[PDB]
Symmetry: C3
Subunit: 333 residues, 3 copies
Amino acid sequence: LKLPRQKVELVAPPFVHAHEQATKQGPKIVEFKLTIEEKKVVIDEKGTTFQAMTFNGSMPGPLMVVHEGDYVETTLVNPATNTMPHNIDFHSATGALGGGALTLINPGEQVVLRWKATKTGVFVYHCAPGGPMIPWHVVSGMNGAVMVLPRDGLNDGKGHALKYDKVYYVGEQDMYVPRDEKGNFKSYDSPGEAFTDTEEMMKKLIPSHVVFNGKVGALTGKNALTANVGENVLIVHSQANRDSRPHLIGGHGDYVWETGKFGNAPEVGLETWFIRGGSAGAAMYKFMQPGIYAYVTHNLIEAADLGATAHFKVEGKWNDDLMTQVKAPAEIP
Amino acid sequence: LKLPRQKVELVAPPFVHAHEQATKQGPKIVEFKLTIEEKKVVIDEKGTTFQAMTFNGSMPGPLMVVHEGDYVETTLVNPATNTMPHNIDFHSATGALGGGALTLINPGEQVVLRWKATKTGVFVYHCAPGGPMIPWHVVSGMNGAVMVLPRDGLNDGKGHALKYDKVYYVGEQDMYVPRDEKGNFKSYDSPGEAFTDTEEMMKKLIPSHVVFNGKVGALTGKNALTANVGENVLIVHSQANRDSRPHLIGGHGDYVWETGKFGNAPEVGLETWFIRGGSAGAAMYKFMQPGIYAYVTHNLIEAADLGATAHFKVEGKWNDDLMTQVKAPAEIP
Amino acid sequence: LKLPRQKVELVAPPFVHAHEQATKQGPKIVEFKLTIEEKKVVIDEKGTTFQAMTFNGSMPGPLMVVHEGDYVETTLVNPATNTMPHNIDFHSATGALGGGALTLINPGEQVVLRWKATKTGVFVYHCAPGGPMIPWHVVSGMNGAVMVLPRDGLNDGKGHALKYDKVYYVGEQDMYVPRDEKGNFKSYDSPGEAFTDTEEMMKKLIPSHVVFNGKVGALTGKNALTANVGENVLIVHSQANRDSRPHLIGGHGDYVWETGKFGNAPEVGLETWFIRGGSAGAAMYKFMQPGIYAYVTHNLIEAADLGATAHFKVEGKWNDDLMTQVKAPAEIP
Ligand SMILES: OC[C@H]1O[C@](O)(CO)[C@@H](O)[C@@H]1O
Ligand SMILES: OC[C@H]1O[C@](O)(CO)[C@@H](O)[C@@H]1O
Ligand SMILES: OC[C@H]1O[C@](O)(CO)[C@@H](O)[C@@H]1O
Ligand SMILES: [Cu+2]
Ligand SMILES: [Cu+2]
Ligand SMILES: [Cu+2]
Ligand SMILES: [Cu+2]
Ligand SMILES: [Cu+2]
Ligand SMILES: [Cu+2]
């Protein structure tokens, strides 16, 4: 394959490596490296720990961005410091179980897979070693997403360009942390040691935690997402194992691809959209009002109580036409 | 804001206050009042009780209907006879967490919020005080919906008007009533007293009851929904916290906006549609056959066993072309 | 009704009786017979048993295929060897609870129902005797699907014919098998004897098993689905009670009707789609690569651990342009 090669420096979520939307480039081989890391992490503000398994150290794995007709060449590395075999499956790719059947690597090995980006949209990628290990590796954190843009950029299905000013990637993770008899979350010395209890819980289908970017509160405070009034923000949302229903509290989805695929026109003016487990979707919104927004899954129990809330802090001028407090709280006459 | 003012007399669900579909009116300030009521109610035919919190005394809160570009001015009242702070968040509105950040009122207070109806469709509204109180107030009943109609009324996305002969609002409520050791549902003296047990159950994500209009069997018997053969009925369905899959048993969704937003064309000829938790959707059907219909969520366990069944009683002439019993039950030859 | 009559020989899933896509035939009365069978079956590779209730002996019931405007005349037979009353409800039909209100038959009886196929798409049919029996009969296996094709065959919504080379019907079944105190699955002597424990479990909303074609591994091994590179395969997927999220691992949904209704254009290029509980949907894919594929629900816990995995074995030539292993696993430099 005699095409130009381009390296990408991946960046940790929720940020997204620099890329063009519309491009004059033709097909290239776009080179990415993912290095697997198994590690024990803290997942909530109480100090609960979790045996995570990750691409590039993060949950989710980083967003990869290419254009239709590019070839995506990934070097997947499984250092000898890990304990388990791993692989990678791209929902964007055609053949060999998405790549999984060509990428199984033991600790100490690496592999190089190339796939042609023939389908546009946002797509999940995840580890899938085989059998019961498939769900376990995924719900341990081994999932991310790839975006395959049209070469002319995004459009509204009516002939008009949609151009985003910035993009964020929100990866949602269902986590299954068992409890002891008295009701405290358990801690484990290794992923292998966590497996039996964790699988028992998994099969009951109810997560203990549902988080964005790997942790309760990850996308809040210093790490809130940001925008200004007038900016059009693309929010890519993935969930590799379990459904979600994103909602921007105080905003909308102006243009939404909930099934995540750019060969389809977006829907307009949504309140809440739906990410099928095993997929990525995307929503664009032009901010109109300053202040704090919450970005949630709109099962509010999961949002407020299990971890699945992000914030935006938005700068700009308040628009009293759109909303105003006519009378502040006062005693009832 | 120098626009005409129009008061609306809200009516309890499943009915909907009188309104125009297509209108020659221009933008107005449309005035609504919602008075919060915390109250213990009965939710099933066994006499199980429930610590409800409501807008205007009902579950769901009443449907508000306006047109695109109207300004919706709501007086939210929290009488001193209530125990908790409350607010209101409109998914139809832009800014301040949908209004929640401008409407927090203690018992004995009221507040007046105005928002411009810039997005068409059906939308959830709900209380959202902050933090863990958000899901608790919602699943205690503090949710309803608003419909923002195009000024030209509804259309099919192909240039033709859809006009409904009547509209009903079905609000679905997931309820979390704990049980005692021997397995009976518990009763509580106050919402505050119900909170700890109720939150514990909430986080396990499985409701004890899933009801329409606040109670098992609410929309049956004397209170069945009604229609005649030839009538086009709009059914607005909301679920502020948890997914649902509406289905009209013996009918269809002729025109369905499952994501609920009129800037999108409806889908046609559905059997079952999907209401994302945190949203409202809408379906229109022209009745063709008389008799009883059931309107359900098509998780039939929730429909038949947890409470989520309504009936329609339809008058008119049976159509043997559409369906006929060729041979009544008989012994097998 | 003076139309020609045509008998169909039904075939067991996942196969589909022979039919035309586009046809020059006009409306006919298409005759089907379904014979109910209650039977104890094995549902997993451990030998767990299950009190099934079936149409024609299979889970799912067989796929019925007709064209728009046909009249579907079904003889439903409930032999005296069964223990319970049964009926049939077609989501494709108009009136009488889909037919259920006209087809209730005791053991030893049969009934003949005709309905006009006025809505195109794939649709669930299921038993629905009344009250709590409704979910129980459905989740015991009493559900299948019917496909109502346009007379001109399928199209892409842009004026082009879609023609499938073969069709498979994947019926997904949520099953609720209780466990004893020590944690083993229970066995029962009759459906009636299984009812109390099974209903208790049902109302908690978590299945023990989620299977395709009635059993873990049913659509694997000798019974894997098959295709060749270049073949366009239609996959009809139904779920009468509970949501699913189909995904073809290593492939896509080239054209997908997730809500299942052919009056709507398909979506294109999906990774994962969504079958609402109480519905059928359909996806077409043209295979591009040989080898094994897994067809799953993409809650991977349900796929890998609860039973919901099928395989395709695909013959043909590997396409190194679409995907290639650039470097096989090797030691990290
Ligand atoms: O935005 C994508 C959509 O836009 C169009 O190109 C033009 O309407 C469609 O063919 C496609 O589905
Ligand atoms: O019904 C709403 C839909 O109808 C149209 O106005 C005409 O096709 C579209 O632009 C819109 O999405
Ligand atoms: O494929 C079905 C779709 O195709 C059309 O006939 C042509 O665009 C539409 O009217 C219909 O919704
Ligand atoms: Cu792995
Ligand atoms: Cu996958
Ligand atoms: Cu409240
Ligand atoms: Cu909300
Ligand atoms: Cu039955
Ligand atoms: Cu049904």
